[PDB]
């Protein structure tokens, strides 16, 4: 995304999609984003055909236009996002796994009186991961969602 | 009407010499009471207060016991109907 | 038999579905639907097969009471 | 279980917020987090609170987590 | 037409289906279903109907420059 | 075997007089390289490492780009098809 793009405008060249490394995949926001790219360039390029220049001069206004609208925006939010997730290896790895078997423990019904289906549920999250290991994960993924 | 549609689709057998939801004091409902929540609060639309009185089509009685329960005043005089008697509830 | 539970948050035109959808509950079930009316009578004949004698329409009234005072029947 | 949900409902009747805003505010969020308009994305995660603390304030929705956390024991 | 967007968190053998159905997105979409050879040969037709020259089966190998050093094609 | 079972599904206009997949240094995969990720991360299984070398089977390639860059030292001059050649994606 933003660490990793290039220029996304030259001497005569111009640069869209996925080209500029432009996609926002925690939404799935990739065609939203090519689509838009296309429009910003091509409304660049119709600013440069009318002034005849098509050097960085007048093609940087597609950067211009492409931190302007939602492209950037959506890259400078979502920045530092994988590397979150590469540090954790919690949130696909324990956390659907055991929501999973919270949930099946809150609705089956098998005679337990329900506050010790309340401390089985607080015996389920906090055996795979201690509690300053959940309200941690929380905000840190907080980080990572701006 | 509009409830006496769906109350065709339930199953009675309707006993009628033997009205089951009997009103204790008329006079009750025409000037204690307020808001009728006999009439407001009835899923089967048994109560209609007239001014000829209270009309109670305890025919279509769903035998829930709403009506014994929201009086204020406990002015309804509520029985079950008898055996084999009331709603018949078919896939209830 | 259930196998998903879902609790719907139903909005103005949109809906929060949040359900939980078990696959062991095909071959252990957790619960069952039930229609009451085709249950209780399936339940009444096992619980008549038990020996127990079912009295159908019949509505108690009272209690007798044996003069002791107390519910004697 | 009737110890624990004992003081359940005359704790959803002095509410009266669980089921008037609630569903309606989190239906209004999570459509307007999945809808796409050109919209940059933190001007979505800004409309979602402008959306939640509008209906509600936050002395209002940090209270009501467990003002019912009494409900649920 | 895309009226309802899940996320299910799949477990060992359950899942936890969090999804949001609307339904303005049956009259206003917000998002199709594409397969991407069915939309962008649609896609190549309106853009051969507003007037540009698609040349497919042609890969481009590098750009032909002018003595400036820029790229002239 | 099993993912050319699926491989079969997909089209194909093969330019087998010109693969676009050439190692540039074969002794980089024999000694240099200890996990060979270009096999153990090919959706396609091009790549495969026998004794004899490497063998790409170029003809199955999707196209994705994964076995350059996950190659660590870069010794995968990899190329598009030709226009007209390579996967050819319906309904993709
Ligand atoms: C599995 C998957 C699921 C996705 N799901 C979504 C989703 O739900 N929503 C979403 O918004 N995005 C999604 N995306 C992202 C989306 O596919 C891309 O971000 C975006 O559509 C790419 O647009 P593009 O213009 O770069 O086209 P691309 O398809 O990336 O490529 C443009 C074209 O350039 C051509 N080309 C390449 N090199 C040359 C060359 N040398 N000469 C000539 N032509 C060349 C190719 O043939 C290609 O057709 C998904 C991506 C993947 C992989
Ligand atoms: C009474 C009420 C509080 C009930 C709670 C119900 C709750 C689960 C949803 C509504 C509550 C609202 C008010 C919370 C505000 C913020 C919301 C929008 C956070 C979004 C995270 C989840 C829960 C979204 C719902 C599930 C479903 C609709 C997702 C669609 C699938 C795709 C399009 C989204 C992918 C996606 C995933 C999978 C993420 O994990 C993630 C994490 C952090 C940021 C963004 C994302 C993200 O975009
Ligand atoms: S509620 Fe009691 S008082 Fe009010 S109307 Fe019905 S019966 Fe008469
Ligand atoms: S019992 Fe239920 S239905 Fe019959 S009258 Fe009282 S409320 Fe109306
Ligand atoms: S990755 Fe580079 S080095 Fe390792 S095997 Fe494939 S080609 Fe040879
Ligand atoms: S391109 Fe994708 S498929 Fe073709 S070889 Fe490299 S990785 Fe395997």
């Known amino acids: 995304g933003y660490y990793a793009m290039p220029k996304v405008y030259g001497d005569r060249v111009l640069v869209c999609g996925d080209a500029a490394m432009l996609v926002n995949s925690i939404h799935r926001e990739g065609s939203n984003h090519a689509i838009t790219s296309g429009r910003l360039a091509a409304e660049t390029l119709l600013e440069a055909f009318e002034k005849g220049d098509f050097s960085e001069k007048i093609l940087k206004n597609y950067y211009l236009r492409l931190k302007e609208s939602f492209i950037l925006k959506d890259l400078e939010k979502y920045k530092d996002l994988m590397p979150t997730m590469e540090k954790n290896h919690q949130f696909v790895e324990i956390y659907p796994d055991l929501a999973n078997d919270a949930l099946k423990r809150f609705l089956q019904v098998d005679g337990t009186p329900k506050w010790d289906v309340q401390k089985q549920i607080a015996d389920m999250v906090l055996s795979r991961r201690s509690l300053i290991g959940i309200s941690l994960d929380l905000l840190r993924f907080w980080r990572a969602v701006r | ?92 | 038999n259930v196998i998903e539970q879902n609790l719907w948050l139903l909005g103005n035109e949109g809906v929060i579905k949040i359900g939980h959808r078990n696959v062991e509950w095909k071959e252990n079930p957790n619960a069952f639907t039930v229609l009451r009316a085709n249950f209780d009578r399936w339940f009444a004949q096992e619980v008549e097969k038990a020996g127990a004698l079912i009295i159908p329409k019949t509505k108690v009234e009272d209690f007798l009471r044996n003069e002791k005072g107390e519910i004697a029947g």
């Open chain 2, 1 to 92: 009407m509009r409830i006496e549609d769906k109350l065709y689709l339930n199953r009675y057998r309707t006993d009628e010499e033997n009205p089951h939801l009997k009103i204790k004091d008329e006079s009750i409902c025409a000037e204690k009471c307020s808001d009728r929540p006999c009439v407001s609060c009835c899923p089967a639309d048994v109560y209609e207060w007239t001014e000829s009185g209270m009309e109670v089509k305890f025919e279509g009685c769903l035998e829930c016991g709403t009506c014994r329960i929201v009086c204020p005043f406990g002015n309804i005089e509520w029985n079950y109907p008898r055996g084999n008697y009331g709603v018949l509830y078919k896939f209830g």
